[PDB]
Amino acid sequence: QIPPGLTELLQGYTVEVLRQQPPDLVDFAVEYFTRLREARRGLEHH
Amino acid sequence: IQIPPGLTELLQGYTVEVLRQQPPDLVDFAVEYFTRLREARRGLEHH
Amino acid sequence: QIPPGLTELLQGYTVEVLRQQPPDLVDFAVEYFTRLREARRGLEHHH
Amino acid sequence: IQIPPGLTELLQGYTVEVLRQQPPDLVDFAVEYFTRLREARRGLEH
Amino acid sequence: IQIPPGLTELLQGYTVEVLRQQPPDLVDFAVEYFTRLREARRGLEHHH
Amino acid sequence: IQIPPGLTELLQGYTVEVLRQQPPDLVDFAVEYFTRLREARRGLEHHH
Amino acid sequence: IQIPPGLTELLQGYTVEVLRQQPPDLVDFAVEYFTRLREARRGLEHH
Amino acid sequence: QIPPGLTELLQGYTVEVLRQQPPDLVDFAVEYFTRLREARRGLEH
């Protein structure tokens, strides 16, 4: 039982790892999901 | 397509803890989990 | 040279040891990696 | 962040064996390895 | 007595491989196993 | 589980020296101790 | 002539330490070595 | 280079292990060498 939205979340991270090719995958995870959270807050405020 | 080295392990480590801890928000937990992970990594490297 | 995915795997186990503070590291390893494999299978079953 | 007594030793023991044995799957090998290790510890305790 | 941190784990690691690999000589295998362990450690520290 | 003959003695000998000498690094000392044990054994087998 | 399991390993451990510590009295050192060895075994058992 | 007297010391312990078949080799070592030391003291008086 995979919770709703988990695979989409991981695919968004993945498509960007593939495009941006950041050297550190762990650093990029922190940076990417921080930006995602901010994008969501912008969407929710709008 | 080539998934880069270590990506699949990273996603699966996050996934096991989503299933174990059942967080109320997946994005918040993503920021939390990977921050603690990066810090765990620093701990190991300074050991 | 270390195989791809090895350090990521160890770091995921390490981050949980630090958070969960298990009484026994070996018991936790068995539990942890067993659940990780189950999470992997779940992911693969989903799609 | 203090690495618990014994942790690095466990990780290094698993790692030296990945390097020796070149398992086809690291997760399967982690399950198998730490299971055997617990069985070894049990024998040493008896 | 006061067993230092990591000793039991070290010995269990060696032990699990003695049981697995059934080496004909335990002493030879000890030198062999701990030398490889040390080199694995160097490898892990270099990766970072 | 079947522990092979001589293993637990091997581990206890390493252990009594860890407790006595308090080496800075367990793995480094394991290499040194078991290398030296091998030499001692070679000595005993040549005196024969 | 069968040597019991563990005997040569015992003797070699005492011998390596004679070579390390150069006791001038072999018998005094044996009493101390095997008394310390028993203590060490007791430590491993209560851990 | 094995120091003088070491091998005959181990052989004396070994002959008694084979004969007495002690249940614990370490205990017997403490016992055997403590007794050997008492015997030596005896001989020196």
From Swiss-Prot, chains B, G:
Q: Identify the segment of the full-length protein shown.
A: 4 to 45 of 401
Mod. after translation? Phosphorylated by the activated catalytic chain.
Which protein, by its recorded name, is this?
A: cAMP-dependent protein kinase type II-alpha regulatory subunit
- How does the annotation summarize its subunit structure? The inactive form of the enzyme is composed of two regulatory chains and two catalytic chains. Activation by cAMP produces two active catalytic monomers and a regulatory dimer that binds four cAMP molecules. Interacts with AKAP4 and CBFA2T3. Interacts with the phosphorylated form of PJA2. Interacts with MYRIP; his interaction may link PKA to components of the exocytosis machinery, thus facilitating exocytosis, including insulin release. Forms a complex composed of PRKAR2A, GSK3B and GSKIP through GSKIP interaction; facilitates PKA-induced phosphorylation and regulates GSK3B activity.
Query: What is the name of the gene encoding this protein?
Result: Prkar2a
Per the entry, what this protein does is: Regulatory subunit of the cAMP-dependent protein kinases involved in cAMP signaling in cells. Type II regulatory chains mediate membrane association by binding to anchoring proteins, including the MAP2 kinase.
Q: Hey, what tissues is this thing expressed in?
A: Four types of regulatory chains are found: I-alpha, I-beta, II-alpha, and II-beta. Their expression varies among tissues and is in some cases constitutive and in others inducible.
Q: Where does the record say this protein resides?
A: Cytoplasm; Cell membrane
- Lineage in the entry? Eukaryota, Metazoa, Chordata, Craniata, Vertebrata
Q: Which family does it belong to?
A: Belongs to the cAMP-dependent kinase regulatory chain family.
